[PDB]
């Protein structure tokens, strides 16, 4: 099966809980981080740490080296400014995966990619524009791409009881970060989501 995985964005809101969950599942986890201060120093911890930036292809190449699959949870935290970090980072990730024969990438964009584009809140259009750019990168890559498109990410506890809607909008507008990370790892265990959009949501 999949044993060795790389996570990008592992120090983020969803990355931290995905990292913990993956380590407890038994995965051998490699992370690319800009600052190891934002990784936990005890408890569930990754087996390999690369220090660097997803914009530097050499750093991405040594993170993807030797992996079986890739989880992408890159984002901008509280910065809503125009950016190309996620799409450019995604071009780096795709090339390193092809250079190392990795096929499986599970990447998080957002449910707004399933919305009427005129209906996106103006404050979120700039970030959304780069999710679109990133989704196009991965769609065009030809890899085995699970497009995870969550609605609002909350901080409710882990339930593992969430719904997953394929290629459409789901009946709830929230997923907890813990259930979102749980589902990113579920995508590693099956190929039933490959080439589909997935919307995870639950009522808390
Ligand atoms: N919040 C929501 O309601 C919501 C809803 C739908 C979709 N989403 C999308 O879901 C995704 C994840 O959300 P999130 O809140 O879990 O992520 P997040 O809290 O914003 O964490 C972002 C991650 O990306 C990393 N990162 C940013 N730039 C990087 C770079 N140049 N090189 C390496 N790493 C870099 C950050 O590392 P650092 O720690 O060094 O900054 C961090 O680990 C995002 O794309 C977000 O837009 C969010």
First to last CA, the chain: 33
Among 8, 11, 12, 60, residue to substitute to test ligand 1 (most atoms within 8 Å of Cβ) = 12
State the Cα–Cα distance between residues 198 and 176, nearest whole angstrom. 15
* Pairing label, strands 28-33, 163-166: unpaired
The Å distance, Cα 109 to ligand 1 centre, comes to 10
Q: Crossing angle for the helix pair 85-99 and 57-64, nearest 10 degrees?
A: 50
Is 54 known to sit in a ligand binding site? yes
Is 189 known to sit in a ligand binding site? no
Out of 20, 164, 187, 188, which one is annotated catalytic?
Answer: 187
Q: Are 64 and 91 in contact (CB under 8 A)?
A: no
The Å distance, Cα 177 to ligand 1 centre, comes to 12
With a 6 Å cutoff on the Cβ, whether 13 touches ligand 1 is yes
User: If you compute the radius of gyration of the chain from its CA atoms, what whole number of angstroms results?
Assistant: 16
CATH of the domain at 66: 3.40.50.720
Q: What is the resolution of this structure in A?
A: 1.9
Total domain count, the chain:
1
Domain range for 44: 4-201
Structure obtained using: X-ray
Closest listed residue to residue 187, CA positions, set 74, 109, 105: 105
Out of 108, 134, 147, 184, which one is annotated catalytic?
Answer: 108
Q: Are 19 and 38 in contact (CB under 8 A)?
A: no
State the Cα–Cα distance between residues 122 and 31, nearest whole angstrom. 33
117-106-54 Cα angle (round to 5): 85
Catalytic residue check, 108 = yes
The 3-class secondary structure across the chain, one letter per residue, is CCCEEEEECCCCHHHHHHHHHHHHHCCEEEEEECCHHHCCCCCCCCCEEEECCCCCHHHHHHHHCCCCEEEECCCCCCCCCCCCHHHHHHHHHHHHHHHCCCCEEEEECCHHHHCCHHHCCHHHHHHHHHHHHHHHHHHHHCCEEEEECCCEEECCCCCCCCEEEECCCCCCCEEEHHHHHHHHHHHHHCCCCCCCEEEEECCC
CA atoms within 13 A on the CB side of 128: 17
With a 6 Å cutoff on the Cβ, whether 184 touches ligand 1 is no
The Å distance, Cα 10 to ligand 1 centre, comes to 9
């Amino acid at each position: 099966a999949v044993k060795k995985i790389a996570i990008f964005g592992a120090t983020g809101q969803t990355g931290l809980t995905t990292l913990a969950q993956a380590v407890q599942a038994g995965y051998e986890v490699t992370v690319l981080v800009r600052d190891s201060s934002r990784l936990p120093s005890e408890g569930p911890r990754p087996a390999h740490v690369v220090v660097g930036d997803v914009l530097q292809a050499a750093d991405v190449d040594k993170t993807v080296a030797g992996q079986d699959a890739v989880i992408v949870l890159l984002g901008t935290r509280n910065d809503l400014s125009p950016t190309t970090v996620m799409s450019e980072g995604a071009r780096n990730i795709v090339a390193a995966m092809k250079a190392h024969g990795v096929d499986k990438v599970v990447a998080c964009t957002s449910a707004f990619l399933l919305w009427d584009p005129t209906k996106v809140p103006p404050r979120l259009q700039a970030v959304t524009d780069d999710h679109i750019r990133m989704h196009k990168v991965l769609r065009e890559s030809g890899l085995k791409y699970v497009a995870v498109m969550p609605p609002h990410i909350g901080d409710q506890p882990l339930t593992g009881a969430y719904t997953v809607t394929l290629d459409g909008r789901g009946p709830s507008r929230v997923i907890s970060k813990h259930d979102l990370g749980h589902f990113m790892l579920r995508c590693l265990t099956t190929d039933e989501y490959d080439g589909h959009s997935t919307y995870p949501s639950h009522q808390y």
